[PDB]
Write a protein that binds this ligand. Sequence first.
Ligand SMILES: [Mg+2]
Length: 216
Amino acid sequence: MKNIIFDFDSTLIKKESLELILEPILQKSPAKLKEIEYITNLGMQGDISFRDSLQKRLAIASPTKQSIKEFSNKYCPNLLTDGIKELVQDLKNKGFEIWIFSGGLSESIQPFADYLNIPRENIFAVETIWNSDGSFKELDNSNGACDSKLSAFDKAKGLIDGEVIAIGDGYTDYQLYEKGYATKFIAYMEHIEREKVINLSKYVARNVAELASLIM
Ligand SMILES: [Mg+2]
């Protein structure tokens, strides 16, 4: 009967996952990676829709099955926010159910969720279909995550009872509160300072101690 919803990118992990997944693919095209970063920020500032952000980034470069595995191999667990595993366990100990709603790729999140002891069934993120050669075939938006966290929450809300605290660095996290799906939004700005989102938020944390201080 109480719930924490984390974003993954720049919240549970220190960086943006899709950019890191694509960086090897784009070593010869550094401007494309800067472009992907810029588009990510437009979506996370609420300047363009999340769907438009995701589609444009995938148009710039689409990942492969193996690119996600290489990302996991390199960055799980060292890319995790300082102190996050212990915070997650402290929250579980205090009775919170932990969820991840993200615009990152679900397959990239799973190893991290495993490490953090967050159930796999509690991850509502961007699902991908690969061709038999590992290349990108298409998104699978059955869960709504390719449109927004709002759509994903709407589809999943029968599984979520009671208070919901949304924690994240982006406008899409704020939207969960705006729409009333979350009872509280805490802007998480350890890794990035998003002025538009900070300005909308009543609560801001810049490390896991500050975050704990706002919740427990
Ligand atoms: Mg984020």
